[PDB]
């Protein structure tokens, strides 16, 4: 199942969180990475005192469980220092969210796909969809055209 993977890092160097990131998506087992987006620097959603984040998506192909995925990627975020403040939207050092897991629908505690918030944001949107322009969510529309009704700013490159 190809899963997209947004990728998001404010603090301690967020090029290096990136790559260092990238190479270790590239390590979970039972996957490989398909496609890798641009990298974009974004104002922060939420609180104003934190940096501005790189963001970018990834294409993995998994035969994981979803569950199993997030064991993972929650695990990158661990090995490179990601802390969750208390307040909603701060800062991190890597923040690792599964936009989709192929065509799914999951709701359980721990997990929610589509990404809740996802088609509110350009800087997840954007970068998916240079990675993948003809996608279709799960409720039948087009990445494509929720971009166009949204209109959201292009992003700037890193
Ligand atoms: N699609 C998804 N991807 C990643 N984590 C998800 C998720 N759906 C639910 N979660 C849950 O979200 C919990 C909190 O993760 P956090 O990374 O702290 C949220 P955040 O990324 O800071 O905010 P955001 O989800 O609004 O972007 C995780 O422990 C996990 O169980
Ligand atoms: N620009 C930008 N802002 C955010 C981002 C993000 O990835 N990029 N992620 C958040 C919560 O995970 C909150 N705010
Ligand atoms: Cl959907
Ligand atoms: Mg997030
Ligand atoms: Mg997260």
């Given at each position: 199942?190809?899963?997209?993977?947004?990728?998001?890092?404010?603090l301690?160097?967020?090029?290096e969180?990136?790559?260092a990131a990238?190479?270790?998506?590239?390590?979970i087992?039972?996957?490989?990475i398909?496609?890798?987006?641009?990298?974009?620097?974004?104002?922060?959603?939420?609180?104003?005192?934190?940096?501005?984040?790189?963001?970018?998506?990834?294409?993995?192909?998994?035969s994981?469980?979803?569950?199993?995925?997030?064991?993972?990627?929650?695990?990158?975020?661990?090995?490179q220092?990601?802390?969750?403040?208390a307040?909603?939207?701060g800062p991190r050092?890597?923040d690792?969210?599964?936009?989709l897991?192929?065509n799914?629908?999951?709701?359980?505690?721990?997990?929610?796909?589509?990404?809740y918030?996802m088609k509110?944001?350009?800087?997840?949107?954007?970068?998916?969809?240079?990675?993948?322009?003809?996608?279709?969510?799960?409720?039948?529309?087009?990445?494509?055209?929720?971009?166009?009704?949204?209109?959201?700013?292009?992003?700037?490159?890193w």
């Open positions: 199942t190809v899963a997209y993977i947004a990728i998001g890092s404010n301690a160097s967020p090029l969180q990136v790559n990238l190479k270790a998506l590239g390590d087992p039972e996957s490989h398909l496609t890798v987006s641009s990298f974009y620097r974004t104002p922060p959603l939420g609180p104003q005192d934190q940096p501005d984040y790189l963001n970018a998506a990834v294409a993995l192909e998994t994981l469980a979803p569950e199993e995925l997030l064991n993972h990627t929650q695990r990158i975020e661990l090995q220092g990601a802390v969750r403040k307040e909603r939207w050092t890597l690792l969210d599964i936009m897991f192929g799914e629908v999951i709701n359980t505690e721990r997990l929610t796909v589509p990404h918030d509110n944001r350009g800087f997840m949107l954007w970068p998916l969809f240079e990675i993948a322009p003809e996608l279709v969510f799960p409720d039948g529309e087009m990445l494509r055209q929720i971009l166009h009704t949204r209109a959201f700013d292009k992003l700037n490159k």
